[PDB]
């Protein structure tokens, strides 16, 4: 084959070349790579084709021959430094001098087509910059190579990572994803991409939630950190192997789908695209380069391989000792590689710069002294060179410019395909109508942080940097003491705060005020009851000699009426602002006159029971003592035992006026409360026994038709008492705590009204309307 014999070609101006032709210490010997690489040979053949076409043309470099010295440089820089030193050696000599500056050198090559590897391009460019040798490198992408401070003579024909990262940031901003997580490979490519994207996101308002590095083949902690934050957009600016390892681990761990913004490294790599189960990890949106392709490169490669097979030419006529023993099948897979255009355009740019430098027309090129390599730089900056009908230009920083295509993956039968859904030519323009997202419906995966917090909320700093304020609502009873607080602070426990309030509001007192409608109804009922009691009292004190009052007591009846009126009056002391004395004296003051009246009714019941259901021998002595001074002694004894019990339970059982600070929603309480069922139960034990004895001795009796039934009234009065307080107790145990005193007043008023309407009112009816029934033979 002798293919490697074509790596040199004599010419007036000869170009250099650093290609990855081969692949992989104590003594200082250069390592030797014997493994063959198809991409390097394809690129070398592409540059040879570019040079041969440029020689073929007559309007570019007329009458001048362009050569090339394609030197094999492996990925290691040690094996690549020797070709550079050979390049800078004086032509015809194997020794390179060490002069003070570049102007005294006589390099054997006009320019250099730099290495594909960027890590190698760093060293090669830093070495060539001292000699000001114009090197244009295909495939060198990271941004720092554009620094003119340390690379005054480094150009390139591929866009920097800065433009693609700017496109990605514009995409995230335009789609609204301003809360994204940025990841990069552990090599310098990922780190530089991460730094550039940090700068761009900080400038554009985009936030990085987590900035980790996926290690080259750990990922578990990086994915855990990504999943901890609620992030739905992840920028994976990593090489092929790191991205493949991350996606395989995500296959193993079943990570939730996310929108992966892809770098150009793994966007179009069949390794990641062919991963099993990869379709279950959301959309993948990347920016693929928009560059033309050599429509005639495969034909040239095939015809040159066939011509090299012929021994006649090859005899008519190392760097790549392994390049000779190859066949067409060993290089067929890489004919359609997009870096061939980059190499071709780099060679065309070198030739166009040389043509401009010599300042010649299409007819010919004037004779002059040989042009030094450092003279190309004045015409390499600002170089408009047409490559395949498309004009390209070198920026002031040696960066070529070209458009980008936003390509999103689509899945049909586990076949990922790239659809153009946007264009980036310095200003993003996306067609999001035709984008098919991965969610349940075709809706954009939302990933956004609050740039500012709504007024009345607590702000918590989120993100890697101090990025976004996670607005937090604090539940009622708490307020933001100061804007810089990280948590809402409670009030003084005696004051209420509404939901989402800047400051707290005081708690006022809400007791049973005299203006509430329930108290007004109770007051009207009290007025009616007191009026009825007064009317009955007047009727009983005027007709005092009539048989009615005399048979039904006498002065005792007026005393009981006065007692009921006093109970009605003492009802008035329940509501209002609960002064300690008032709340303390509520019960006994309402319980004493009731005790007296019930004792009078019990005396009448005892008299009736004695006359009814005991033998006359006992009756003649019991009836003559149950009425009069002994009756007065009995009622005074009942009143005095009531007083004794009342003072005993007032000194022992404490009636307290507490303020339940945490019962009502917005207001406080002033609650007058006593022992649970103990206080009023003990106070009413006496009245319960009195009413029970009266009812028991009265409710069965013989009522002769020629007489007056003096027991029905007492029976109905005790029935009203028992029924009204049996109904009262559940009302006390059920009604809201505010209306508890109102329920107590209502119970007392109903008890008094029932006793009156059962005992006194029927008597007054016949005392005032039909006075024909007040005969002593009918009553005594």
């Amino acid at each position: 084959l002798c293919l490697s014999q074509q790596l040199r070609m004599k010419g007036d101006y000869v170009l250099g070349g650093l290609f990855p032709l081969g692949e992989a210490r104590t003594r200082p010997s250069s390592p030797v790579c014997t493994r063959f690489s198809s991409n390097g040979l394809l690129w070398a053949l592409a540059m040879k084709m570019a040079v041969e076409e440029i020689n073929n043309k007559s309007d570019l470099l007329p009458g001048l021959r362009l050569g090339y010295d394609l030197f094999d440089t492996c990925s290691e820089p040690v094996v690549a430094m020797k070709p550079s030193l050979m390049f800078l050696a004086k032509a015809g000599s194997r020794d390179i001098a060490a002069y003070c500056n570049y102007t005294q050198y006589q390099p054997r090559v006009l320019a250099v087509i730099g290495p594909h590897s960027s890590e190698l391009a760093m060293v090669t460019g830093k070495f060539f910059s001292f000699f000001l040798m114009p090197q244009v490198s295909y495939g060198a992408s990271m941004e720092l190579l554009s620094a003119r401070e340390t690379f005054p003579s480094f150009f390139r024909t591929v866009p920097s990572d800065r433009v693609q990262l700017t496109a990605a940031a514009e995409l995230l901003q335009e789609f609204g994803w301003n809360w994204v997580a940025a990841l990069g490979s552990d090599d310098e490519y990922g780190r530089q991409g991460l730094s550039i994207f940090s700068a761009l996101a900080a400038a554009r308002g985009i936030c990085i939630a987590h900035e980790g590095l996926v290690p080259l083949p750990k990922v578990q902690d990086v994915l855990h950190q990504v999943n901890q934050s609620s992030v739905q957009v992840v920028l994976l600016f990593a090489s092929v192997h790191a991205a493949h390892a991350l996606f395989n681990y995500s296959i193993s761990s079943r990570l939730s789908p996310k929108v992966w913004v892809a770098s150009e490294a793994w966007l179009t790599s069949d390794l990641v695209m062919g991963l099993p189960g990869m379709a279950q990890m959301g959309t993948v949106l990347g920016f693929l380069q928009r560059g033309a392709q050599l429509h005639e490169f495969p034909q040239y490669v095939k015809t040159h391989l066939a011509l090299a097979t012929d021994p006649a030419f090859c005899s008519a006529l190392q760097r790549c000792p392994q390049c000779d023993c190859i066949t067409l099948q060993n290089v067929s897979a890489g004919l359609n590689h997009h870096q061939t255009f980059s190499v071709y355009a780099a060679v065309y740019s070198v030739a166009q710069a040389l043509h401009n430098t010599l300042q010649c027309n299409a007819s010919g090129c004037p004779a002059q002294d040989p042009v030094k390599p450092w003279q190309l730089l004045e015409n390499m900056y600002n170089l408009t060179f047409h490559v395949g009908g498309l004009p390209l230009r070198f920026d002031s920083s040696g960066n070529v410019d070209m458009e980008y295509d936003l390509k999103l993956w689509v899945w049909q039968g586990s076949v990922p395909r790239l659809h153009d859904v946007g264009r980036f030519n310095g200003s993003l323009r996306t067609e999001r109508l035709k984008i098919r997202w991965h969610t349940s419906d075709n809706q954009k995966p939302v990933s956004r942080c609050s740039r500012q917090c709504q007024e009345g909320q607590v702000r918590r700093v989120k993100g890697f940097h101090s990025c976004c304020y996670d607005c937090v609502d604090c539940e009622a009873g708490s307020y933001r003491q100061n804007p810089d607080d990280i948590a809402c602070t409670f009030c003084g426990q005696d004051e209420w705060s509404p939901e989402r309030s800047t400051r707290c509001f005081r708690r006022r007192s809400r007791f049973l005020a005299w203006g509430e409608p329930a108290v007004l109804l109770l007051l009207l009922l009290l007025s009616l009851a007191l009026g009825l009691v007064l009317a009955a009292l007047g009727l009983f004190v005027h007709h005092r000699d009539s048989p009615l009052v005399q048979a039904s007591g006498g002065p005792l009846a007026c005393f009981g009426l006065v007692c009921l009126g006093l109970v009605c009056l003492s009802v008035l002391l329940f509501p209002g602002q609960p002064s300690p004395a008032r709340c303390l004296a509520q019960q006994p003051l309402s319980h004493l006159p009731l005790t007296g009246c019930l004792s009078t009714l019990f005396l009448q019941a005892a008299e009736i029971f004695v006359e009814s259901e005991l033998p006359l021998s006992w009756a003649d002595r019991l009836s003559g003592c149950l009425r009069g001074p002994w009756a007065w002694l009995v009622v005074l004894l009942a009143m005095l035992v009531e007083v004794a019990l009342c003072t005993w339970y007032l000194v022992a059982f404490p009636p307290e006026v507490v303020t339940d600070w945490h019962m009502l929603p917005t207001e406080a309480l002033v609650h007058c409360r006593t022992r649970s069922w103990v206080s009023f139960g003990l106070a009413h034990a006496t009245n319960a026994t009195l009413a029970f004895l009266c009812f028991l001795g009265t409710f069965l009796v013989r009522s002769q038709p020629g007489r007056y039934n003096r027991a029905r009234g007492l029976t109905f009065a005790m029935l009203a008492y028992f029924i009204t307080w049996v109904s009262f107790v559940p009302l006390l145990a059920n009604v809201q705590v505010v209306l508890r005193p109102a329920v107590q007043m209502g119970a007392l008023l109903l008890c008094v009204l029932g006793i009156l309407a059962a005992f006194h009112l029927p008597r007054c009816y016949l005392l005032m309307r039909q006075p024909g029934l007040n005969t002593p033979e009918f009553f005594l």
């Binding site: 030193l85 060490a98 028992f722």
Partner: protein, 785 residues
């Protein structure tokens, strides 16, 4: 000049004499830039080391050691000196496949002071394996020997600097820091390394920010001003008070000036090796109010006889203003000691020792054989000697472990400007010997830089955000505690039915409260039940002592005997109520008490019916009355009521269950009352409902004939007892509906005993009265009336 000294074996050097602090065709030489003093200091150190090697007859005897020092700029000029060193005496460097035969002009090189230039030089020297012992280059990329075969170091890498920072943070208990880096590769790499290292030591980073690259002696753009204002605002609004800065000293003037302008104080600044020893930043002298300024730097080693030597004194190989610049900074350099000077000293001595071992000299004679650079590299890789009480030996990763030192800035010129407070030993990765540090607090308290306060004893830890060290303290709800041994992130309930108070970390067994014999209300009810049982026993004895009497034959003889025995049984099983509730006690209670009570009440009601309403019913349904008189109607009705109660009570058993229940009372769940029926309210309501349904008809029939003498005024006493029972049941229902607690059992038992006493007394006590004290009313002749 002093840049050259002829000798048998040269020793190239690269020192940064000038720096850039304010067109490619014109190449800017280093002499046009501002003069640095550290470069000349290190150059004088290396010259002194070489002169001491020449003086010493014990080391390299008869072999003069030379050197060739070339001024290397920070970035600009780093290729020409390399080509000068590698070329022959004729400034011609041959190109060949192997360099084993090649003999370079210099035999070793002391590399540049900045990492980028070190990498650039090492990438060139890799072809010939020229030994290159760099100093003050702290990047971690130089640790691997795959791409730097001939690169060695005299300074611990950034790994040990980061480790010292982390150990200093751990000692003072800081777990909430702020990382500030620079846009260059050094700051970014150090920040990434620190973030990777610190995440495994339970210390979190509040936020990471990058300061714009900004050389001094130039005026600032508005965008960078806004950036710095934003950085300072973010720093001030954050709660972290430990700020580490990974940036060269040139770009930190504006940041600190802006910090001073914004009036922000109280940060424990931590400095990397770049600006922890720079004198200008200390000479600013307005940062003393910002807070303590710690830093990481190489331990100073006092070189004997070096200060007097320093004070005694081709292309890019000259400087003129160096002496005048060093004159001003002489006193601060003398006080602060020599830190990087010893690195160059040790590098030169390592080269000399390697050469001595390679020549195999026996302290007197030397073979003077030709020395290839790779042979020297092989030899220096295995040097191990002593130097000023420090051991100089190279690790397999090209590093010699020199002790680090945490230094605190002191604003007092009478002593060392940078006072040392701690020492770090890279060999054991341990930071020890920490002295007192003058803090910026009120009474010299260690600054607190924790993101979350320690949780109070017995409080759940709720994570707040992404950072692990940040959390919120929320009290565990009542009924649970925390097992800090197991897990402090969630409350763990205490089994075996025990409750716990708020913020209580020790559950206590619930005290089982229940009815007991030795109690006041229990003994009161027992006394009442015993009195009733004795009274009923006396009544039964009287009745059996007097049969064949109109009172006992007109009344149901066997009926009353059965009722009396049932009341006896109920009273005797009343004491079963009190005591530890088991299955047997509940079974006996529910199978005995309702049966006896309901059968007694049903007999009462049917007796009242047959003594009052039967006479009236005799008119409407005569054949029904013939049926009733033919059989024993009251007995049939009592049997029907008995089987109905069997059915309903068995249904209640199958519904509400039979196991004793525990009911957490509303007052102090410390206690737990035990009852027989878990649903007691509905069971008591059902029982009282059936009993009252029978009671209404019984009492109504009694009242319908309350005046008929019948069986010695039976109706009146039935009415008396039945109204008593009705009032008792109503009172029990009301108190049940308005109260729920411990007293439920005693109240229910008292109500049951009172009902039994009513049924006994108000239905049999009048009979005892008539039998005993009225011996004339029980004669048979009284039947007619």
């Amino acid at each position: 000049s002093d840049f050259y000294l002829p000798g048998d074996y040269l020793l190239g050097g690269l020192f940064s004499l000038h720096a850039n602090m304010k067109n490619f065709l014109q190449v800017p030489m280093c002499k046009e830039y501002e003069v640095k003093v550290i470069g000349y200091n290190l150059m004088q150190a290396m010259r002194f080391a070489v002169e001491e090697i020449n003086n010493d007859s014990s080391l390299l005897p008869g072999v003069l050691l030379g050197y060739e020092i070339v001024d290397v700029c920070y970035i600009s000029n780093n290729v020409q000196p390399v080509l000068y060193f590698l070329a022959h005496e004729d400034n011609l460097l041959p190109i060949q496949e192997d360099y084993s035969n090649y003999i370079s002009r210099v035999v070793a090189v002391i590399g540049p002071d900045n990492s980028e230039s070190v990498m650039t030089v090492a990438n060139f020297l890799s072809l010939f394996l020229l030994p290159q012992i760099t100093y003050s280059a702290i990047s971690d990329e130089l640790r691997d020997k795959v791409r730097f075969p001939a690169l060695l170091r005299t300074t611990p890498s950034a790994d040990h600097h980061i480790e010292a920072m982390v150990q200093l943070m751990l000692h003072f208990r800081w777990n909430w820091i702020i990382v500030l880096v620079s846009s260059d590769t050094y700051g970014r790499d150090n920040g990434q390394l620190l973030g990777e290292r610190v995440a495994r030591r339970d210390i979190c980073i509040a936020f990471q920010e990058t300061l714009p690259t900004l050389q001094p002696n130039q005026n600032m753009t508005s965008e960078e001003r806004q950036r710095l204002v934003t950085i300072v605002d973010k720093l001030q609004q954050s709660t972290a008070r430990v700020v580490v800065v990974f940036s060269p000293d040139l770009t930190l003037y504006h940041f600190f000036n802006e910090v001073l302008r914004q009036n922000f104080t109280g940060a424990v600044w931590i400095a990397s090796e770049s600006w922890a020893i720079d004198p200008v930043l200390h000479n600013l002298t307005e940062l003393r109010h910002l807070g303590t300024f710690l830093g990481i730097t190489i331990q100073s080693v006092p070189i004997p006889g070096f200060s007097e030597f320093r004070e005694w004194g081709t292309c890019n190989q000259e400087c003129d203003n160096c002496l005048n610049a060093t004159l001003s900074f002489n006193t601060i350099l003398r006080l602060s000691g020599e830190r990087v000077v010893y690195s160059v000293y040790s590098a030169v001595y390592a080269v000399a020792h390697a050469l001595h071992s390679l020549l195999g000299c026996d302290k007197s004679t030397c073979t003077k054989r030709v020395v290839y650079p790779w042979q020297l590299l092989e030899e220096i890789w295995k040097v191990n000697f002593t130097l000023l009480d420090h051991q100089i030996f190279f690790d397999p990763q090209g590093d010699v472990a020199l002790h680090l030192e945490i230094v605190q800035w002191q604003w007092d010129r009478s002593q060392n400007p940078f006072q040392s407070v701690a020492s770090y030993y890279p060999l054991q990765r341990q930071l020890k010997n920490i002295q007192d540090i003058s803090w910026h607090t009120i009474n010299n308290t260690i600054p607190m830089s924790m993101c979350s306060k320690r949780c109070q004893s017995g409080q759940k830890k709720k994570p707040v955000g992404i950072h692990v060290c940040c959390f919120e303290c929320i009290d565990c709800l009542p009924g649970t505690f925390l097992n800090h041994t197991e897990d402090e992130y969630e409350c763990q309930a205490c089994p075996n039915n025990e409750w716990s108070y708020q913020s209580e970390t020790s559950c206590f067994k619930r005290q089982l409260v229940f009815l007991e014999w030795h109690e006041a209300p229990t003994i009161a009810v027992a006394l009442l039940a015993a009195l009733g049982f004795l009274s009923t026993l006396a009544i039964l004895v009287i009745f059996w002592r007097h049969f064949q009497t109109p009172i006992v034959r007109s009344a149901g003889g066997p009926m009353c005997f059965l009722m009396l025995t049932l009341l006896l049984v109920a009273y005797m099983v009343v004491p079963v109520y009190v005591g530890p509730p088991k299955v047997s006690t509940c079974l006996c209670r529910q199978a005995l008490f309702p049966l006896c009570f309901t059968i007694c009440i049903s007999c009462i009601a049917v007796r009242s019916f047959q003594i009052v309403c039967a006479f009236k019913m005799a008119s409407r349904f005569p054949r029904a009355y013939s049926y009733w008189v033919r059989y024993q109607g009251p007995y049939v009705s009592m049997a029907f009521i008995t089987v109905l109660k069997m059915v309903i009570v068995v249904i209640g058993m199958l519904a509400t269950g039979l196991s004793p229940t525990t009911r957490t009372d509303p007052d102090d769940p410390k206690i737990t009352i035990v009852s027989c029926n878990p649903n007691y309210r509905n069971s008591l309501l059902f029982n009282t409902s059936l009993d009252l349904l029978l009671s209404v008809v019984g009492f109504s029939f009694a009242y319908m004939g309350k005046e008929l003498p019948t069986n010695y005024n039976e109706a009146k006493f039935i009415t008396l007892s039945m109204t008593f029972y009705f009032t008792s049941s109503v009172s029990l229902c009301t108190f049940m509906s308005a109260y729920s607690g411990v007293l439920v059992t005693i109240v229910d038992l008292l109500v049951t005993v009172l009902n039994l006493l009513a049924i006994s007394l108000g239905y049999f006590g009048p009979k005892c009265y008539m039998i005993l004290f009225y011996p004339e009313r029980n004669t048979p002749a009284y039947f007619n009336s």
